[PDB]
Amino acid sequence: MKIRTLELREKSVEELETLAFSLKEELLRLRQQKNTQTLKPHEIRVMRKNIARVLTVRTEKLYAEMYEKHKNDKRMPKDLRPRLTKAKRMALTKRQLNMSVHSVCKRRRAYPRMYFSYSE
Amino acid sequence: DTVNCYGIDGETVEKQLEMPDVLRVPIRKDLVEDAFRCVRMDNRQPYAVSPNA
Amino acid sequence: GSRKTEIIKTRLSRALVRNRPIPVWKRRMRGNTQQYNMKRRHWRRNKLKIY
Amino acid sequence: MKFNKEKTASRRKNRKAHFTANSTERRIRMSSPLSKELREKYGFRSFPIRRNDKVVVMKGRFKGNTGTVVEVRRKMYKVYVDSCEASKMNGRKVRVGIDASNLKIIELYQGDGRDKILERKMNNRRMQMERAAKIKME
Amino acid sequence: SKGTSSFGKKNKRNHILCVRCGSMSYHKQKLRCSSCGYPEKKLRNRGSPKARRRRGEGTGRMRHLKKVRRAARNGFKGNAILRALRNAN
RNA sequence: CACCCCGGUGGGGGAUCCCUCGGCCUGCGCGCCGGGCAAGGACGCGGACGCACGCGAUAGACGGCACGAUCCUCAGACACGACUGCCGGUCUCCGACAGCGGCGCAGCCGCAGACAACCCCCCGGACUUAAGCAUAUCACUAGGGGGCGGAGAAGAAACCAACAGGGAUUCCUGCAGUAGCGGCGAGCGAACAGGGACGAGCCCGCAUGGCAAUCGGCAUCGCCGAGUUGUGACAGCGCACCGCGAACGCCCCGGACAGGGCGGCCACAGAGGGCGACAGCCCCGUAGCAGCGCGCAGCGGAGCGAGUAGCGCUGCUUGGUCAUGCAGCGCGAAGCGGUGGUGGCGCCAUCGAAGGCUAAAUACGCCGCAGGACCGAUAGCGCACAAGUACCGCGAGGGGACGGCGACGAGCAGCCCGCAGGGGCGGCGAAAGCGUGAAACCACCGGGGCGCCCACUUGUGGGCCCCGUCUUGAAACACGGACCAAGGAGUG
RNA sequence: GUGGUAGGAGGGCGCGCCGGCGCCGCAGAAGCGCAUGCGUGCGCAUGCGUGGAGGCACCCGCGGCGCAGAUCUUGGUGGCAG
Numbered sequence A: 001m002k003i004r005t006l007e008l009r010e011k012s013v014e015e016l017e018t019l020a021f022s023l024k025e026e027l028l029r030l031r032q033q034k035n036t037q038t039l040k041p042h043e044i045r046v047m048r049k050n051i052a053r054v055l056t057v058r059t060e061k062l063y064a065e066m067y068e069k070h071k072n073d074k075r076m077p078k079d080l081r082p083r084l085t086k087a088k089r090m091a092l093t094k095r096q097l098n099m100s101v102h103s104v105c106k107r108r109r110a111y112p113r114m115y116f117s118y119s120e
Numbered sequence B: 001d002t003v004n005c006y007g008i009d010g011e012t013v014e015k016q017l018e019m020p021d022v023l024r025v026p027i028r029k030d031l032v033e034d035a036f037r038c039v040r041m042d043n044r045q046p047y048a049v050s051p052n053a
Numbered sequence C: 001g002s003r004k005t006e007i008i009k010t011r012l013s014r015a016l017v018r019n020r021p022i023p024v025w026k027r028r029m030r031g032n033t034q035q036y037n038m039k040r041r042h043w044r045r046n047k048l049k050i051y
Numbered sequence D: 001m002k003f004n005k006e007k008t009a010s011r012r013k014n015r016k017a018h019f020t021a022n023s024t025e026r027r028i029r030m031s032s033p034l035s036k037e038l039r040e041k042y043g044f045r046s047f048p049i050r051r052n053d054k055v056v057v058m059k060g061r062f063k064g065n066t067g068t069v070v071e072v073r074r075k076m077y078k079v080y081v082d083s084c085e086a087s088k089m090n091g092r093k094v095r096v097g098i099d100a101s102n103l104k105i106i107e108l109y110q111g112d113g114r115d116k117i118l119e120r121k122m123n124n125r126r127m128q129m130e131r132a133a134k135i136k137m138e
Numbered sequence E: 001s002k003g004t005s006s007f008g009k010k011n012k013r014n015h016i017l018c019v020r021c022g023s024m025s026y027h028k029q030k031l032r033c034s035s036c037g038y039p040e041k042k043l044r045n046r047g048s049p050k051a052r053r054r055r056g057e058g059t060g061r062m063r064h065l066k067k068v069r070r071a072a073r074n075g076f077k078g079n080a081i082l083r084a085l086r087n088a089n
Numbered sequence F: 001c002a003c004c005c006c007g008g009u010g011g012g013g014g015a016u017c018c019c020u021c022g023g024c025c026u027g028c029g030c031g032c033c034g035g036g037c038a039a040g041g042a043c044g045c046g047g048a049c050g051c052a053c054g055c056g057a058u059a060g061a062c063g064g065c066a067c068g069a070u071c072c073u074c075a076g077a078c079a080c081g082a083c084u085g086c087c088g089g090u091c092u093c094c095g096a097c098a099g100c101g102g103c104g105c106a107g108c109c110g111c112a113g114a115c116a117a118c119c120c121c122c123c124g125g126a127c128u129u130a131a132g133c134a135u136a137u138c139a140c141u142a143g144g145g146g147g148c149g150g151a152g153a154a155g156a157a158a159c160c161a162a163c164a165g166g167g168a169u170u171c172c173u174g175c176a177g178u179a180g181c182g183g184c185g186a187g188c189g190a191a192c193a194g195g196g197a198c199g200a201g202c203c204c205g206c207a208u209g210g211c212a213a214u215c216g217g218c219a220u221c222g223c224c225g226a227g228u229u230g231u232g233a234c235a236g237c238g239c240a241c242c243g244c245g246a247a248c249g250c251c252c253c254g255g256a257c258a259g260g261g262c263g264g265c266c267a268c269a270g271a272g273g274g275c276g277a278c279a280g281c282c283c284c285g286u287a288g289c290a291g292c293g294c295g296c297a298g299c300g301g302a303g304c305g306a307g308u309a310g311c312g313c314u315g316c317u318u319g320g321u322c323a324u325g326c327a328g329c330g331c332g333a334a335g336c337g338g339u340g341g342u343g344g345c346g347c348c349a350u351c352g353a354a355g356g357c358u359a360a361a362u363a364c365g366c367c368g369c370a371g372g373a374c375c376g377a378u379a380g381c382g383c384a385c386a387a388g389u390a391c392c393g394c395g396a397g398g399g400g401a402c403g404g405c406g407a408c409g410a411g412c413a414g415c416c417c418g419c420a421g422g423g424g425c426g427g428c429g430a431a432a433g434c435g436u437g438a439a440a441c442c443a444c445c446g447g448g449g450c451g452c453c454c455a456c457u458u459g460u461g462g463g464c465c466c467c468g469u470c471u472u473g474a475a476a477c478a479c480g481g482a483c484c485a486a487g488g489a490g491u492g
Numbered sequence G: 001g002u003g004g005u006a007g008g009a010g011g012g013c014g015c016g017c018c019g020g021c022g023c024c025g026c027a028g029a030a031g032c033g034c035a036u037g038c039g040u041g042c043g044c045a046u047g048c049g050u051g052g053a054g055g056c057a058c059c060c061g062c063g064g065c066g067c068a069g070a071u072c073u074u075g076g077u078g079g080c081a082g
């Protein structure tokens, strides 16, 4: 947690792409020092994890950006649709299940639900 | 044979009831044991080994 | 046998790096009930099925 | 009796829940009673023990000793109090592990936001006592 | 002849690594795995009642299924970043 | 001297007992896979990392939120959030294509693969029972193939009935081990009722003709397409959902109090677990306490089902009997037809097939949860342990064994000897030193010499062949038995 | 009055657990070893040693309830055999 997420929200998506490449370089210099010399035990750990932290903030900013790009799209990208289940994505909608023929509409309209109470 | 009904004071007799005829029934100790044996195995839950075991 | 496919050598390398004792710092960990690696494999006694 | 069917009275599941408790639950299970001087201020019965807590030992060999908590270890459930020690052979003094139930907190540490956590339990206890007072009023 | 002498000639290896199931059961001549039946599309009908216990579903990592159990438990709310964006509009 | 027997000490081994983060069973809940790349696999990923488990090049905690001080073997990390929890990201590669299919289709989609308990469709045994056996039985099972779903299938009468008539399906009870089938042998074997659970009903087709009023797609209010070989209709949903929870002191014993004794206290809490012995009051807990909203609009209604029904033949099936069902083939309908335990014909009675949908009651494994007159490490799952692991098999596959110090605070290496393993004096601890430590067996020591029964003055006499078993008959030159522990067979 | 195979019957002993009921246990439970006693017998009780946390008796109820054998099963160990 050497690189904090608070600073990564300020950077842009392509600015996080360059940061992950720059942090990958420093990890290669750390893996050099681990082989040749000693290192503090979690230096490779920390630099590996803030590469992941930069890339996560990159992904989280990119999901937010791509959603507002293709929000009012006819077909949104599959990334931005909710991954329910293949069966649940192929389910009929509640509007489609409520679809009934004209005779069922007229009958429910002409004979609606009654609210009543009985007593003997 | 009349029984007292006590208050929560525990000493004052409030009513004096007659004994109900249930409590004057001569006890058949064998019959209460025979019924207790079958009543005890009303909540008897099953046990078995696994059929593959 | 000095001629092998890419899959054979990767499986042979994975069998080789696996075949090592418990690192000695693990014997000082609490709750470490393992004293020696019981899954050690010797090349003459135990065969690998890498064909 | 326990009338909640969804909680276990099972010994096996309660014992497994104790030894495979996670670290958040193991902190709660390592609670310790307060003194009466702390309970007049805070009100709650006990609180989870922490490092730098002043503690009087209530049971065991060190019973009646006072000292600060210098080490809590959640796995194996042991609180190590300053001035509750035993020597090794090489003269090295080791703190002796005491269960948290055998310790009573004399002075609560309040440094690392713990005064917030004490006041959160204190206020929720005070608020829940107000609801039970109104319900018994009605 | 029949026994100890004939075992010296057993230096062919007929069943090699299957690319689908990873057992050493893919035959070279037959070009079919004896365990899982690759390259048939459906899995081979397992030859024993215990073979499902060794090789079936749940005996592996269940990488997608453990995720979809966790999403189903929470109500399939899905991606946490996109969840707040659909909630705002 | 050896040998044998008995005891003591020490071995040997792991029985017993006590324990149990495990199993088993029952109930309930859930019932959610997949080109958005599944199941499964391969290969990689930890600072020191083999196994296990976790994970995917964002590779041994990446983000958000909650939590709030430790994690630990070393080194280190940590309020700029340790350890955690919940959810989400990332999620290599092999493994679902000679792909197949839908839609005018700039293109957009679907199918495949997994799951195999439950359910639906097809295929379909034999052992077995009949004291043989062939039909029968096992069994319309096992098994194989295909296919779904959270249930499925079924389902709104071409039904039951013969009454004073009932009224979808499914399930329960019951009819009923009955009618009946059956080398009428073995055996098999339903239905209507009556009672109940649960309840629910609907639709397409022959829709206007003063104009397809209908739909799909798009780069969208306009094109293009479908379509007259005929398109056409909205009543149901959603959110919220806590944190706190009462009450104990002294004395004794002890390594330690939860024990004993005395005295209290709380209880809508005396369920259970932890804590150095057995705790209502030490801890975790336990009893106890909290809801709501938003919706429903219109325009046809007599439409009707053919290579079918039925008949004939055949094969299968069924309790179904001069045919119950199903199929194939031949024949092939009607305006009235079907049916009436099932020969034909006639009556009378009762329904309307050959098109479609339909909740609930019903079934069920994994998994989650909760229980139990279950089992307690040779038991219980194969697995309480690095178990579908080690290991074996070319392969399909096969498949074990192994639990326990203590207050997880101490439990060491001081001195002498030995190259060393170690030994001896010591050391820690209440003790054990990975609980208890039976027997077989063994070492040494001590005592004694029938293998047993009887008798007594204990070494003599008298009596005794090896048990089990089958057998007319066993000491048998009948068979099984080296020893010991544990397990081990009339149950449901 | 007194034998007894196959066999039937009765009454008890013993084991795991149950509903009760009397109790016991760190001042030492079960288990185990050796003794003594009781008992026709199944078996029971005690003493001492060990052990270190549970157990006993009786009445009830449930039963996977009693072993010398099965070329029994599993484990251990002998003789053979230095």
Ligand SMILES: [Mg+2]
Pocket (backbone or CB within 6 Å): C001, C002, C003, C004
């Ligand atoms: Mg080679």
Ligand SMILES: [Mg+2]
Pocket (backbone or CB within 6 Å): C044
């Ligand atoms: Mg070899």
Ligand SMILES: [Mg+2]
Pocket (backbone or CB within 6 Å): E009
């Ligand atoms: Mg050859």
Ligand SMILES: [Mg+2]
Pocket (backbone or CB within 6 Å): E014, E029
């Ligand atoms: Mg060949």
Ligand SMILES: [Mg+2]
Pocket (backbone or CB within 6 Å): none
């Ligand atoms: Mg001896």
Ligand SMILES: [Mg+2]
Pocket (backbone or CB within 6 Å): none
């Ligand atoms: Mg054993």
Ligand SMILES: [Mg+2]
Pocket (backbone or CB within 6 Å): none
């Ligand atoms: Mg279950």
Ligand SMILES: [Mg+2]
Pocket (backbone or CB within 6 Å): none
């Ligand atoms: Mg994937």
Ligand SMILES: [Mg+2]
Pocket (backbone or CB within 6 Å): F061, F062
């Ligand atoms: Mg993180």
Ligand SMILES: [Mg+2]
Pocket (backbone or CB within 6 Å): none
């Ligand atoms: Mg399929």
Ligand SMILES: [Mg+2]
Pocket (backbone or CB within 6 Å): F128
């Ligand atoms: Mg059979």
Ligand SMILES: [Mg+2]
Pocket (backbone or CB within 6 Å): F130
């Ligand atoms: Mg026969």
Ligand SMILES: [Mg+2]
Pocket (backbone or CB within 6 Å): F131
């Ligand atoms: Mg026979």
Ligand SMILES: [Mg+2]
Pocket (backbone or CB within 6 Å): none
């Ligand atoms: Mg025969």
Ligand SMILES: [Mg+2]
Pocket (backbone or CB within 6 Å): A087
């Ligand atoms: Mg499904």
Ligand SMILES: [Mg+2]
Pocket (backbone or CB within 6 Å): none
């Ligand atoms: Mg259906």
